[PDB]
Structure 1
Amino acid sequence: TQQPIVTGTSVISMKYDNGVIIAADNLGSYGSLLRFNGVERLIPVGDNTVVGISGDISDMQHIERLLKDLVTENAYDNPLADAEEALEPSYIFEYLATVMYQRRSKMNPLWNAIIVAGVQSNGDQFLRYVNLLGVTYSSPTLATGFGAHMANPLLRKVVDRESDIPKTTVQVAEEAIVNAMRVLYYRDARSSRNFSLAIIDKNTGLTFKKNLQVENMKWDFAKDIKGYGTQKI
């Protein structure tokens, strides 16, 4: 049993017709202090998987090393390490899900909420969630922390059920994700303007976008707002 110290906020993600999108801001908070502004919380594994992590950063860095170590181990005595016997998203997830539940069962959890986004060998989209309790679930849209409360509602308006996935293009999906990140910046007190976004497509592969910013913000209406009730000036 511990308490999280340096923390990362929402990870948001969704499926679209040919793959999955995932995003997460570049902030490492220290309570209310916005301590570290250059933290990458999307960690790619191979060319077909991106693991997005929220929660305790020291535990994220540990998980980051486990995944790095997993790729090394898979390559050992494996002539097809970059082909048929490459790491799948489903393998990477199940491994993490095992570790998370084992650690919670020893009463010493990895204080995280994780989303594994990727594309399988047969072109199927993979999107599944796991957290410090070892709880897992899958859905057309997945989000951690504040993202669950604010991002999911917006993303679910695009893909409300399984049958909406083939109807959703990468441009529409990316637009919804970027808009959701803006909403979280307005409303989550532990968020930052700078974020990273990753697309895993079955045709065009892994596209990792760094140093993105929330733009097209609405603040002008603030000038008209005065006082807290009766004040006019």
Structure 2
Amino acid sequence: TQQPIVTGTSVISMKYDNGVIIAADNLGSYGSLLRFNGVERLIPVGDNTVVGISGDISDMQHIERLLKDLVTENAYDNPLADAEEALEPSYIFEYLATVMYQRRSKMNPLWNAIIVAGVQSNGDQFLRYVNLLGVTYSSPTLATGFGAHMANPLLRKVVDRESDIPKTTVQVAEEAIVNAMRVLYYRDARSSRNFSLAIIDKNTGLTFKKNLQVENMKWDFAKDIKGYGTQKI
């Protein structure tokens, strides 16, 4: 049993017709102090998977090393390591899910919420969540922390059920994700303007975008707001 120290906030994601999108800001908070401003919380595994992690950063870095070691271990005595016997999103997730549940069962959890986003061998979209309790679930949209409360409602307006996935393009899906990140910047006190975004498409492969910023923000209306009730000046 511990308490999280340096933490990462929301990770948001969704499925679209040919793949998945996942995003997360670049902040490492130390309580209310916005301590570290250059933290990458999306970690690619091969060219077909991106693991997005929120929660304790020290545990994130530990998980990052497990995944790096997993790739190394899979290549051992494996001539098809870059082909048929390459790591799949489902393999990577189940491994993490095994670790997370085992750790909670020893009362020494990895204080994280994880979303594994990727595309399988057969082109199927993979998107599943796991957390410190070992609780797992899948949905067309997935989000951690504040994203669950604010991003999911917005993303579910685009993909409300399974049948909406083929009707959703990558441009629409990316637009929804970027808008959600702006909303989280307005309303989450432990978020930053800078973020990373990853697209895993079954045709165009893995596109990893760094140093993105929230833009087109509405603040002008603030000038007209005066006082807290009766004040006019």
- TM class, shorter-chain normalised? over 0.9
Do structure 1's residue 134 and structure 2's residue 107 form an aligned pair? no
- Per-residue deviation at 1:42? 0.1
Give the alignment of 1:19-38 within 5 angstroms: 19-38=19-38
**3-state DSSP of counterpart to 2:203:** coil
Paired with 1:112 and 1:61, the residues of 2 have a C-alpha distance of 11
Q: In structure 1, list runs of 5 or more residues that go unmatched.
A: none
1:93-144 Cα shifts (integer Å, max 9, x gaps): 0000000000000000000000000000000000000000000000000000
Give the alignment of 1:188-227 within 5 angstroms: 188-227=188-227
- Per-residue deviation at 1:226? 0.2
- Per-residue deviation at 1:33? 0.1
Q: In structure 2, list runs of 5 or more residues that go unmatched.
A: none
Paired with 2:191 and 2:226, the residues of 1 have a C-alpha distance of 26
1:30-66 Cα shifts (integer Å, max 9, x gaps): 0000000000000000000000000000000000000
- Per-residue deviation at 1:194? 0.1
Do structure 1's residue 125 and structure 2's residue 125 form an aligned pair? yes
Paired with 2:205 and 2:97, the residues of 1 have a C-alpha distance of 25
1:137-170 Cα shifts (integer Å, max 9, x gaps): 0000000000000000000000000000000000
**3-state DSSP of counterpart to 1:208:** strand
TM-score (ref. length: structure 1): 1.00
**3-state DSSP of counterpart to 2:207:** strand
Paired with 2:226 and 2:64, the residues of 1 have a C-alpha distance of 48
**3-state DSSP of counterpart to 2:74:** helix
1:201-230 Cα shifts (integer Å, max 9, x gaps): 000000000000000000000000000000
- Per-residue deviation at 1:175? 0.0
Displaced runs of 4+ in structure 1, greater than 6 A?
none
- Per-residue deviation at 1:20? 0.0
Paired with 2:173 and 2:7, the residues of 1 have a C-alpha distance of 27
**3-state DSSP of counterpart to 1:23:** strand
- Per-residue deviation at 1:14? 0.1
Paired with 2:224 and 2:41, the residues of 1 have a C-alpha distance of 38
Do structure 1's residue 70 and structure 2's residue 76 form an aligned pair? no
1:3 aligned partner: 3
1:60 aligned partner: 60
Identical-pair percentage: 100
